[PDB]
Amino acid sequence: MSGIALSRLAQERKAWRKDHPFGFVAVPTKNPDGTMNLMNWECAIPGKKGTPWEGGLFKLRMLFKDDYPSSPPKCKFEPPLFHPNVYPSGTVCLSILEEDKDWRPAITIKQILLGIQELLNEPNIQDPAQAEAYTIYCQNRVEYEKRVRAQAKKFAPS
């Protein structure tokens, strides 16, 4: 039922408002009527300090199902980013985002955002999602980091 999902989502929003990591943003998107959607969140992940991603505010969208929290949400970067584990559509290929492996219903939205943030600097070579991103990474590593730094400053908050 959605009742279980919406109750869990209500806990997530209240917990996020009272306490959340600095730089991060997580808020239910605004419906056309002016209201907001608890099953659709607009998120923003800050680049990790000391990394080529530092200085960037990368925006993604969380899509929850009625099966939540039994099923993980669909994390979708808008716009899509240059990253090996990010499909061209913008969808994130992360282990904790699949109910068939390494996904626990007790995982907080915060833990997901913090998980995706680490995936940025530390991509998984095991599951290539993007073609060119996986290519440049396993070849011209110097070129790869230049692409990331240019992308971070491109998505610099202002």
Binding site: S2, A5, L6, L9, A10, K14, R17, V27, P28, N31, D33, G34, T35, M36, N37, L38, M39, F64, D66
Partner: protein, 106 residues
């Protein structure tokens, strides 16, 4: 478990506004300070937000403009205290004074 406190309020969905729903009804009558009113539609549609600047543009509009009709179900959750309340909407145009609403209650 589980019997959440649930009441019924009679009003005109085409007359009363969201701000009146927020201040006059949920906060003033039902004793809330920072309420988050959600429309029980299985879509997780939240009408009133406790966070300032988010849903301050819906205050002037009427409830009917958000699909709120007779028999609608609203869940008001206070942000500053564990207070959840299920409010049923009994659309009635004949009130008298005319008053804004009435809880039945009472």
């Amino acid at each position: 478990s589980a019997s959440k406190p649930e009441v019924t309020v009679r009003l005109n969905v085409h007359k009363v506004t969201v701000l009146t729903l927020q201040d006059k009804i949920v906060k003033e009558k039902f004793a809330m300070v920072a309420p988050d009113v959600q429309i029980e539609d299985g879509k997780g549609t939240i009408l009133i937000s406790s966070e300032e600047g988010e849903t301050e543009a819906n205050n002037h509009k009427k409830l009917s403009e958000f699909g709120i009709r007779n028999g609608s179900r609203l869940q008001a959750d206070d942000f500053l205290q564990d207070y959840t309340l299920l409010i049923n909407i009994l659309h009635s145009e004949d009130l008298g004074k005319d008053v804004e609403f009435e809880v039945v209650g009472d």
